[PDB]
Curated annotation (Swiss-Prot), chain B:
EC number assigned by the record: 3.1.26.5
Protein name in UniProt: Ribonuclease P/MRP protein subunit RPP1
Family, as annotated: Belongs to the eukaryotic/archaeal RNase P protein component 3 family.
Note in the entry: Present with 6300 molecules/cell in log phase SD medium.
Parent-record interval covered: 1 to 243 of 293
Role noted for this protein: Component of ribonuclease P, a protein complex that generates mature tRNA molecules by cleaving their 5'-ends. Also a component of RNase MRP, which cleaves pre-rRNA sequences.
Subcellular location(s) per record: Nucleus
SUBUNIT field: Component of nuclear RNase P and RNase MRP complexes. RNase P consists of an RNA moiety and at least 9 protein subunits including POP1, POP3, POP4, POP5, POP6, POP7, POP8, RPP1 and RPR2. RNase MRP complex consists of an RNA moiety and at least 10 protein subunits including POP1, POP3, POP4, POP5, POP6, POP7, POP8, RMP1, RPP1 and SNM1, many of which are shared with the RNase P complex.
Enzyme class: hydrolase
From Swiss-Prot, chain C:
One GO BP: intronic box C/D snoRNA processing
InterPro entries: Pop5/Rpp14/Rnp2-like, RNase_P/MRP_POP5, Rnp2-like_sf
GO molecular function: ribonuclease MRP activity; ribonuclease P activity; ribonuclease P RNA binding; RNA binding
Organism: Saccharomyces cerevisiae (strain ATCC 204508 / S288c) (Baker's yeast)
Subunit details: Component of nuclear RNase P and RNase MRP complexes. RNase P consists of an RNA moiety and at least 9 protein subunits including POP1, POP3, POP4, POP5, POP6, POP7, POP8, RPP1 and RPR2. RNase MRP complex consists of an RNA moiety and at least 10 protein subunits including POP1, POP3, POP4, POP5, POP6, POP7, POP8, RMP1, RPP1 and SNM1, many of which are shared with the RNase P complex.
Name of this chain's protein: Ribonuclease P/MRP protein subunit POP5
Other facts: Present with 2230 molecules/cell in log phase SD medium.
Record keywords, A-Z: Cytoplasm, Hydrolase, Nucleus, rRNA processing, tRNA processing
One Pfam family per UniProt: RNase_P_Rpp14
UniProtKB/Swiss-Prot annotation, chain D:
Catalytic reaction(s) noted: Endonucleolytic cleavage of RNA, removing 5'-extranucleotides from tRNA precursor
Enzyme Commission identifier(s): 3.1.26.5
Function of the protein: Component of ribonuclease P, a protein complex that generates mature tRNA molecules by cleaving their 5'-ends. Also a component of RNase MRP, which cleaves pre-rRNA sequences.
Lineage, uppermost ranks: Eukaryota, Fungi, Dikarya, Ascomycota, Saccharomycotina
Protein name: Ribonucleases P/MRP protein subunit POP7
UniProtKB/Swiss-Prot annotation, chain E:
Gene Ontology MF terms in the entry: ribonuclease P activity; RNA binding; rRNA primary transcript binding
E.C. number: 3.1.26.5
Residues annotated as transmembrane: none
Quaternary state and interactors: Component of nuclear RNase P and RNase MRP complexes. RNase P consists of an RNA moiety and at least 9 protein subunits including POP1, POP3, POP4, POP5, POP6, POP7, POP8, RPP1 and RPR2. RNase MRP complex consists of an RNA moiety and at least 10 protein subunits including POP1, POP3, POP4, POP5, POP6, POP7, POP8, RMP1, RPP1 and SNM1, many of which are shared with the RNase P complex.
InterPro entries: DNA/RNA-bd_Alba-like (IPR002775)
Gene field: POP6
Key word Nucleus present: yes
Uppermost EC category: hydrolase
Protein name per its UniProtKB record: Ribonucleases P/MRP protein subunit POP6
Residues forming coiled coils: 51-71
Length: 534, 243, 169, 126, 158
RNA sequence: AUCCAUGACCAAAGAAUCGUCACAAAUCGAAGCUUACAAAAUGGAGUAAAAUUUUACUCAGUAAUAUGCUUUGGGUUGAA
């Protein structure tokens, strides 16, 4: 069916005995005639996969055409209407008839899975002004002609025009005679003395063989819900000049892309993949420096003090004076160590215990009696084992279809096993505004009734909502997740965040509520979370 | 909502009945107060706590709220309540308030002399306290007398009505209100309005300034006619479970 | 810097306060009776003079001089008694005190001066006044057939006060 | 014949529409999860900026859950606001996806089907 | 009091939860008040809808009611169907389907619609606030003939 | 070759969190809660009664909840 693909791409290495795989990032794979494939990749993972294919170039052939093919992405409702105002054809082709008809939908979610277009356009500099497709005549499009698009598919006419992109000499001939601006101007000027003498045309005519034909492909991405247009490289500039003369067309950068994909409850490869070798670097090595550099470079007292905060938890452990974990990033190493230690503290003694008052100070013995010992173990492991040396590990896997939940003086280290997590989106039922790196706690079994009552609604005698009450607090071993992107969600009118939570935490909740608190604050807001199928 | 809870009922004691012109004036002033913005209203009643209370369980509240004003609780949404202002002067003369509790919703007290004032905060069943701001309050009242009652569920009341009648009463009102504010440390203060006429009523967004430029913090001026005045009414209505 | 300001929108209510009238009870009639026009003996000077009288008596020299520095009456209509006054931001409460503690404007008696809103810019009190008039007209044309209020005390006035005297940008 | 034992996943699609930049600025699609005061404010603010588009009415418009909700709003504008409204009952057709029916994931084969419902359009004048 | 419906500022004694009593009241109280004199009576076979029905038999009944075995030289088959509240969704499923198969014999049909409301008053959040709700009422006339001598200016023609 | 004190010059930066403020509209101001549906429209699923028809009901759970809820406002990577 040659429908577009969007998923996750790995890096296999099976060549000698023991082998494994590690997720890399998104990928776009498009099949053609069962023996040609086109792959689109983010630049960062471009080379690593590429050399892998070069391990079998005895059997395949590869063209690094990233300097010869260009693309443009279009989003919105009136998108195809604007693109169709700057494209004409050379001959009569059915794939332009379908393109003409479907450019009048204005709600692209109704269209089916596959909406590929492919044809040959003329030099867009002929028009000298964008022009409609005379579409106002026909305004009785129904849901019966849409079903025709699934049967009247021009397979051969797509393949023939497509194969003029996977061949360098064909798209070299595509430049056979590219016109300069002045000679196009002279050609247009020659239209003031035409023979019909009753027309007054503006667009220049088209020659049968002394002008180039530009192959062109348009595809639809369903998961991101947008339009790709794929074109030869040096042809991009003439087209892009017209596309920005539409009275209501706007160009966007990369931050707007992040915001758009945030609103639709979807991830974002650079910033929001903490289980990939580069997402982990972007999180724990690139944002942290950019934040600390502007933090410690303020006079003390003109910035938020992080280790001097009062009443964060119900009862205080003397390990951390103030806030938990790093102050500048979503620290996942602490999550792994803390959760693993909490699990080990219940090896056979179900009832945990926080601290015993001055048992002792410390074969390099590091006993695992109290939870304060786990916290000081995590404190020791940082700034004295990886701030003076290097070590790499992926403490964050992704959810797997199989079932490997449980586990257990030989190998009992707290950084040896990856702890599986899942990705969720949390919406706030009451006041709140979750920023980045905020923490996500489970709801304690005690005070569940109070939080449920707050969810249902508690009203003042006046008639409004009651907010100023006594907010109860949980322990420090109730930390189960982090939030990686969050701001005011305009599609619902209330604050919302997206983040990750520990997998074993969610599969044991008797309810579906969580508590959210920012970094450097002690206010706990309530929220409800829903899964994302990624 | 807005709550004003000191509209007087035209009757002096248990002997006389209500005439026609008095109720005619009361209806007009109620309509004006409804126009200005108030929604919930209570009706006052003054006795002396030393008189022969009717023995029967009826006709001890001659307000008759469900026959009169029946055409004002619809055709306009304002709701009405009932209250009585006992005047306490002696530490005796019986008539414990277990009887009139069921026949009203709000019970107040208006002490006159030192013995009465110290009795009122000692052990009664009132849920609100008031003073005679017209003239000559027994002065030098301190936190000692008022702390015990305000720690429990009692509230203080201001009327601002006497600031509108005459200058001579106005001066005494503005003198006594400062004392009562500073003695209670700005805790548990609510505002009523003594409206003897359809002229002596006022809006909201100015009287709050009238109390703010006398000593009350602006954070408390916005809860006098509001949450506290709503809570007193809520408790008074919820007291009706005696039956 | 630049000096701030506050604008106060004040109405005048003329309650009946007379016995042996027994009016009807309905949201239409109460508003239609309380909102009669002004007897035209009041003017733009009478209100200002009376509000100056009510300050130097209920407040002293240091209360009547912190407001009189900037106190101007901009717009006033007789068909509907709405008016607009201007003052300093930090000294607006004293003007409100002058407003309440003042009755019996000039020689006219038995009336209430009612400040209904205060706002910073002048562009917004105009919108508030328009919304207020629209609300009154809607509530007077919904109790029954509108023309049962045929006396036209105010009905022809809200439309015709559009921008006749409100071009004070 | 065949019983519709299609408990497998079904991805309901929005009804096909088409707009003209004049129906964009003079139309409201009342959702099922729309709070009452939300739509009340929206309608109250289109009847103030529709003259410049050369129109004289606002087309509230809804189906399913919306209908009674929609009608309630219409009531609030019929009386207690003194405006004239027109009511039209319409039929609508939408499209539903169904699978053709190792272990494979959600990405299965697709077939389209057509199903019809009924809704109401409600024109509120100025 | 703070209870019960309020139709045209007048208290009524009936319960919204039960449908039959409300339908009876709506049938014999307001319908003649909107559909005015028609020579003191016109051939109008009333029909009320409820959320518990079977649409096939109901549309068969509506088909029968508009043709009394092809009455010749008689009155007009004018039908009036009404509903209120959560039952309205069931009515439009009928009223449209009946119009679908009836135009398969290239015949025309004309209908009129009208909308009114019940008011309801109930206890709000706490014991000091009331809340008032609106419940919709929809009535529709189908004719099978041209304009009728009845007075229909408030109705909408479709 | 070391330290302390006073003075001059250069350079960095210009605190964070929580609560209250009357109107079928509000506030000293602004914004958000519009890709119309529960697969109950291959002409939905069932229960009772009486001679296909007539009369009574059950099934929609993140169910829905009415001028209601949520966010923000002086140098945003100092000088507007």
């Amino acid at each position: 069916g040659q429908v577009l693909f969007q998923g996750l791409i790995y890096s296999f290495n099976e060549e000698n005995g023991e082998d494994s795989t590690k997720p890399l990032g998104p990928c776009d794979v498009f099949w053609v005639q069962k023996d040609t494939a086109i792959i689109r990749l983010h630049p960062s993972i471009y080379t690593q996969v590429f050399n892998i294919l070069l391990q079998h170039k005895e059997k395949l052939t590869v063209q690094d055409c990233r300097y010869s093919l260009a693309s443009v992405t279009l989003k919105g409702a009136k998108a195809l209407e604007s693109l169709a105002s700057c494209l004409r054809s050379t001959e009569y082709s059915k794939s332009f008839e379908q393109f003409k008809m479907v450019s009048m939908i204005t709600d692209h979610n109704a269209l089916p899975q596959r909406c590929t277009f492919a044809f040959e356009a003329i030099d867009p500099r002929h028009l000298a002004a964008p022009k409609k497709l005379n579409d106002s005549q026909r305004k009785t499009v129904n849901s019966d002609d849409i079903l025709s698009l699934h049967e009247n598919y021009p397979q051969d006419e797509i393949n023939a025009v497509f194969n003029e992109l996977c061949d360098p000499e064909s798209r070299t001939q595509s430049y056979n005679n590219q016109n300069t601006l002045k000679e196009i101007s002279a050609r247009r000027y020659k239209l003031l003395t035409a023979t019909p003498n009753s027309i007054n045309k503006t667009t220049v005519p088209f020659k049968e063989s002394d002008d180039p034909s530009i192959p062109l492909v348009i595809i639809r991405r369903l998961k991101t819900r947008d339009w790709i247009v794929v074109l030869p490289w040096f042809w991009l500039l003439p087209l892009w000049h017209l596309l920005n003369r539409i009275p209501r067309m706007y160009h966007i950068g990369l931050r707007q892309f992040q915001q758009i994909q945030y609103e639709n409850k979807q991830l974002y490869f650079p910033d929001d993949y903490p289980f990939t070798q580069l997402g982990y670097i972007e999180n724990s090595f690139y944002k942290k420096e950019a934040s600390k550099t502007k933090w410690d470079r303020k006079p003390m007292g003109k910035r938020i003090n992080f280790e001097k905060i009062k009443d964060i938890h119900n009862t205080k452990l003397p390990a951390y004076s103030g806030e938990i974990g790093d102050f500048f990033s979503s620290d996942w190493r602490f999550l792994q160590i803390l959760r693993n230690g909490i699990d080990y503290l219940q090896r056979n003694d179900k009832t945990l215990e926080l601290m015993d008052s001055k048992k002792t100070g410390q074969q390099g013995v590091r006993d695992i009696n109290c939870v304060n010992d786990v916290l000081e173990f995590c404190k020791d492991y940082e700034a004295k084992t990886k701030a003076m040396s290097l070590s790499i590990e992926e403490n964050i896997p992704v959810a797997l279809c199989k079932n490997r939940k449980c586990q257990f003086s030989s190998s009992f280290s707290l950084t040896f096993f990856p702890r599986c997590i899942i990705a969720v989106s949390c919406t706030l039922l009451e006041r709140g505004h979750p920023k980045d790196n905020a923490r996500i706690y489970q709801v304690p079994e005690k005070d569940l009734e109070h939080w449920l009552q707050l969810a249902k609604g508690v009203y003042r005698p006046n008639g409004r909502k009651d907010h100023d009450l006594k907010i109860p607090l949980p322990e420090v071993h109730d930390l189960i997740g982090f939030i990686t992107s969050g701001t005011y969600h305009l599609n619902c009118g209330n604050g919302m965040g997206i983040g990750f939570i520990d997998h074993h935490a969610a599969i044991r909740q008797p309810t579906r509520y969580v508590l959210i608190r920012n970094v450097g604050t002690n206010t706990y807001r309530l929220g409800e979370w829903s899964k994302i199928s990624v | 909502m807005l709550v004003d809870l000191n509209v007087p009922w035209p009757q002096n004691s248990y002997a006389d009945k209500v005439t026609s012109q008095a109720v005619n004036n009361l209806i007009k002033t109620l309509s004006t107060l409804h126009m200005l913005g108030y929604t919930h209203i209570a009706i006052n009643f003054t006795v002396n706590h030393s008189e022969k209370f009717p023995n029967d369980v009826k006709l001890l509240n001659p307000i008759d709220i469900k026959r009169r004003f029946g055409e004002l609780m619809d055709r306009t949404g304002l709701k009405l309540y009932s209250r009585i202002t006992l005047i306490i002067d002696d530490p005796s003369k019986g008539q414990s308030l277990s009887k009139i509790s069921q026949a009203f919703d709000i019970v107040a007290a208006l002490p006159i002399s030192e013995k009465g004032l110290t009795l009122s905060t000692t052990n009664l069943d009132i849920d609100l306290l008031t003073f005679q701001y017209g003239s000559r309050l027994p002065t030098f009242l301190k936190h000692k007398s008022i702390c015990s009652c305000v720690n429990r569920g009692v509230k203080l009341e201001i009327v601002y009505g006497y600031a509108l009648r005459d200058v001579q009463a106005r001066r005494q009102f503005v003198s006594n209100v400062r004392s009562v504010i500073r003695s209670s440390r700005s805790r548990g203060i609510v505002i009523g309005s003594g409206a003897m006429s359809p002229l002596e009523c006022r809006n909201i967004l100015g009287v709050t300034s009238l109390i703010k430029n006398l000593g009350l913090p602006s954070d408390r001026c916005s809860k006098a006619m509001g949450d506290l005045a709503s809570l007193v009414l809520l408790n008074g209505r919820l007291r009706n479970k005696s039956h | 810097v630049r000096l701030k300001s506050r604008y106060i929108l004040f109405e005048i209510i003329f309650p009946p306060t007379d016995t042996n009238v027994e009016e009807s009870v309905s949201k239409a009639d109460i508003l239609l009776s309380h909102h009669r026009a002004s007897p035209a003996d009041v003017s733009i000077k009478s209100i200002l003079q009376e509000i100056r009288r009510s300050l130097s008596l209920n407040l002293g020299d240091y209360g009547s001089a912190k407001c009189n520095s900037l106190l101007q009456l901009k717009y006033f209509s007789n068909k509907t008694s709405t008016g607009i006054i201007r003052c300093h931001r930090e000294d607006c409460d004293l003007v409100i005190m002058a407003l309440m503690l003042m009755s019996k404007i000039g020689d006219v008696d038995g009336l209430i001066v009612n400040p209904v809103k205060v706002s910073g810019t002048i562009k917004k009190i105009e919108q508030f006044a328009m919304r207020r008039n629209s609300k009154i007209l809607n509530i007077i044309k919904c109790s029954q057939s509108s023309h049962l209020s045929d006396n036209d005390f105010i009905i022809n006035d809200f439309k015709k006060i559009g921008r006749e005297n409100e071009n004070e940008n | 014949n065949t019983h519709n034992k299609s408990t497998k996943r079904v991805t309901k699609h929005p009804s096909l529409k088409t707009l003209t930049h004049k129906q964009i600025h003079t139309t409201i699609f009342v959702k099922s999860t729309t709070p009452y005061v939300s739509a009340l404010k929206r309608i109250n603010k289109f009847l103030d900026s529709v003259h410049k588009q050369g129109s004289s009415y606002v087309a509230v418009l809804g189906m399913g859950k919306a209908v009674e909700k929609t009608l309630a709003l219409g009531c609030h504008f019929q009386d207690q606001k003194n405006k004239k409204i027109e009511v039209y009952t319409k039929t609508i057709e939408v499209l539903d996806e169904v699978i053709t029916e190792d272990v494979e994931d959600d990405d299965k084969e697709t077939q389209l089907k057509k199903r019809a419902v009924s809704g109401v359009e409600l024109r509120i004048y100025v | 009091m703070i209870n019960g419906v309020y139709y045209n500022e007048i208290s009524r004694d009936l319960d919204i939860s039960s449908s039959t009593q409300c339908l009876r009241f709506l049938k014999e109280t307001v319908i003649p008040s909107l559909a005015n004199n028609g020579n003191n009576s016109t051939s109008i076979q009333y029909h009320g809808i409820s959320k518990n029905d079977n649409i096939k038999k109901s549309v068969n009944k509506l088909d029968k009611q508009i043709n009394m075995a092809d009455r010749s030289l008689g009155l007009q088959q004018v039908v009036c169907i009404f509903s209120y509240g959560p039952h309205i969704q069931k009515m439009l499923s009928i009223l449209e389907i009946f119009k679908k198969g009836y135009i398969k014999n290239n015949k025309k049909i004309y209908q009129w619609n009208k909308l009114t409301s019940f008011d309801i008053k109930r206890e709000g959040r706490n014991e000091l606030q009331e809340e008032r709700l609106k419940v919709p009422i929809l009535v529709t006339l189908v004719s099978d003939s041209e304009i009728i001598d009845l007075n229909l200016h408030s109705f909408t023609k479709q």
